[PDB]
């Protein structure tokens, strides 16, 4: 079937506010995670975050961010950066039944839903709540929020799954490009961080709690003293393109989808199985006829999830070696936000030759001997890249993207 | 500041047009380009800015800059 | 190409609690609105809605219900109800990479999100939140919570599209067949009912006000006096599956879904263009070389919409414009949970040949004249029909449904 | 009673009867507990007896009797 290409990107995180600054920050093994003051105060136990460190201040007009949430912001500017970066102006994109967007969040937005049943308990009532909440809050905000300014034509849904959300839209994505129903859609996500969502993870015992003192350390995968991933948030998109579209327009083209798993472990709520990111690594590679030279790992950071992924992985793959970094370590974890800029960090790997690290492993636990786990910036010409996002409810996605001839 | 100056602050921040845009004879629908849930906000604006509380029956005759100055003028 | 059936059926609806309590409802016109004393005390103007009519404590196993808000609890019922209809034993569903679920909400749970706030900021802090607001509150908690205890091991995501979310959640379904990637999808959603999430649409001015002591009359979709749409929760699933796989099973098959539009309008955020819903009927109708009987109108009775629906179906159909009926001015509107709501009470039209009427109606639109709305339950053969489903945001799905054979 | 409300709550949580809550039945070795069922007993206790249990003695608390020990332990 038709052939999927990504041609442009954008992003929004904790290392950069767009693709050069988080290819810097890859580079350099850069944390993202600062101290919360927010977080502290609500209560929680869990004093630090992956925080974007931007001014958004004036950057969307009055009529379009007045329906916004964070989530909707931060997937808003990545798409601008990727429309720039792909070469694509208003003529080509807009107002074409040919070109759509699939982009989600894993939570809608815990802010505004909460600040809509205060305003409605308040004094005002009804009058304070104000015409905006429902496009804020409900789930698919991200691409409601995206289609209608940008003028996309074609298809306009968000895909949810928990952490695995931009993962499967992306995959989404290829699926309508394979199918032959779109040229371009864009796709990716954003979540937004708030001590509204953040503290229900807090009482789930989920994030980390033992390394406030040090944020950079707190996240820390398969080191023996992980103790909980750090909530992050953020945007990120990228433009799915069908080949032969792309190359008769002179575009830049980072990496082919090769493939796309998408499983289901039917086992555990908040654990994963294994045989379920087993199958779905290898849906990802059947038909694939490289070696899979760079693993992203989901890699949260969790005392039971970092270990069955690698028991996963060593499944897959067995004697052979790919290259393993938890980018995580120095990003956080933001959520539905987390596949599509796994998968740009993986394509800026791709793109400029090199394997950003796996950091904060202080003592490797037992359990991920025998793997090259990565910790320091090698630099190394590859050719194609794996991405693994798998979320509660036991659902599972993979990626893997590969140089194009 | 004025009465007049707040008013037009108001409209032309929810609005997201330029103070040039709002003058006393502007329509929000057909000259400024309010929709519906603009109608909503900028009643809500309006009664936050100066403690006051319209009543919807007034409120649906208040389509034009001059006509929000005349109201909140008459109404302190 | 592969090709795909309806094979089972399940519901949970505010005109009935299964299939047969629903197909009743329907030839008898019968309103499931009533009024809401919870809307009322909230402070809200529209204290009408489409309630379901069942106590669901302790209708599923403790440890499974632990994780769930009133979507997933809906959506649960319908698909033990589906899976029940098709046929299908755990032997044959269970533990089966080619067995998927795709199921979405539009809202999550704005219940428990709420809960969770004000639960971390009253006296016992993160200790009267405890672990399960995630799973109940996040965006994929109706796949989530579904996927794990029904034990699905193919696709497990959301799709979330406002108030199109079921509908395009059946539509990627059909897509996972016709890529030949599952042999059975469940398809279909859930929406709780509430007035955290009920007030934040009566501030945008969306809701029915004018009709709180009269509640079965306040939805009147095409009505001159129609004054905004009434709320409604419940639940809907649909098993999807290949046509083959069905036919060597000898399962019972309702209707091939032979057509699937899914289009956005680009434009109003809030409003319909016109343009994208005919786009996505023509979509839906390509290839489809039998005229469309019944069309199961999105008609939410809302001023703003109810004709811009019915302007573009003239524009597609011109003269030959098919039976009409909007079971909303029954039902309510269940946003996220309609779309599959609707499509079943399509199927039910089709497989007992009958047309529900479009009640209350007092004065039939003036932009309305000219078309077919069929106001009384009329007898008649169908063999194909056609639902349309719409949401903020712009965004546009159809499903046109045919007897086989 | 306060056996008696000290098993429902344990059944309730985890789906056990009076019988089989032991004072060295074990929540999750014995009666089915994961971790986030741990979380919500704890909670459920702190709801009976009306105390505040610190993660740090919350931890510890594993059987029947290792909660009992707070249940009489300080009421
Ligand atoms: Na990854
Ligand atoms: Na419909």
């Known amino acids: ?92 994109y807009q107002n074409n039944p040919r070109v759509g967007l699939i982009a989600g969040s894993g939570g809608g937005s815990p802010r505004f839903q909460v600040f809509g049943a205060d305003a409605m308990r308040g004094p005002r009532g009804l009058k304070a709540v104000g015409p905006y909440v429902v496009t804020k809050a409900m789930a698919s905000g991200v691409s409601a929020c995206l289609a209608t300014p940008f003028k996309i034509h074609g298809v306009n849904y968000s895909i949810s799954s928990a952490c695995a959300t931009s993962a499967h839209c992306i995959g989404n994505a290829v699926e309508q490009i394979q199918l032959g129903k779109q040229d371009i859609v864009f796709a990716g996500g954003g979540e937004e961080l708030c001590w509204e969502m953040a503290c229900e993870f807090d009482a789930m015992g989920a994030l980390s709690t033992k390394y406030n003192d040090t944020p950079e350390k707190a996240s820390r995968t398969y080191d023996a003293h992980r ?57 990802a590679m059947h038909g694939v006829d490289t070696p899979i030279d760079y693993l992203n790992s989901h890699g949260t950071s969790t005392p039971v999830g970092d270990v069955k992924e690698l028991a996963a992985i060593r499944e897959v793959f067995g004697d052979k070696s790919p290259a393993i970094s938890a980018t995580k370590a120095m990003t956080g974890h933001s959520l539905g936000a987390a596949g599509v800029q796994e998968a740009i960090y993986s394509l800026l790997m791709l793109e400029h030759g090199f394997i950003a690290p796996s950091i904060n492993i202080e003592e490797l636990d037992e359990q991920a001997a025998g793997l090259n786990i990565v910790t320091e910036t090698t630099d190394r010409e590859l050719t194609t890249v794996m991405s693994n996002s798998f979320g509660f409810g036991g659902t599972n996605a993979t990626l893997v993207m590969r140089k194009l001839k | ?44 604006a309006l009664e936050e800015e100066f403690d006051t509380e319209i009543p919807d029956e007034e409120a649906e005759k208040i389509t034009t800059v001059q006509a929000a100055i005349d109201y909140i003028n008459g109404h302190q």
């Open chain 1, 1 to 92: 079937m038709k052939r999927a290409v990504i041609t442009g990107l954008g992003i929004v995180s904790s290392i950069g506010n767009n693709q050069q600054e988080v290819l810097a920050s890859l580079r350099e093994g850069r944390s993202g995670i600062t101290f919360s003051q927010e977080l502290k105060d609500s209560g929680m136990r869990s004093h630090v975050w992956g925080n974007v460190k931007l001014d958004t201040t004036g950057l969307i007009d009055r009529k379009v961010v007045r329906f916004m949430s964070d989530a909707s912001i931060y997937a808003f500017l990545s798409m601008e950066q990727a429309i720039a970066d792909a070469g694509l102006s208003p003529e080509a």
């Open chain 2, 1 to 44: 500041s004025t009465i007049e100056e707040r008013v037009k602050k108001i409209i032309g921040e929810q609005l997201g047009v330029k103070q040039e845009e709002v003058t006393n004879n502007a329509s929000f629908v057909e000259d400024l380009g309010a929709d519906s849930l603009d109608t909503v906000e900028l009643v809500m």
């Open chain 1, 227 to 283: 103790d909980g991933f750090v909530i992050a948030g953020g945007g990120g998109m990228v433009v799915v393109e069908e080949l032969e579209h792309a190359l008769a327009r002179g575009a830049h083209i980072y990496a082919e989808i090769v493939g796309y798993g998408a499983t289901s472990d039917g086992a555990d709520m908040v654990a994963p199985s294994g045989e379920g990111a087993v199958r779905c690594m290898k849906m």
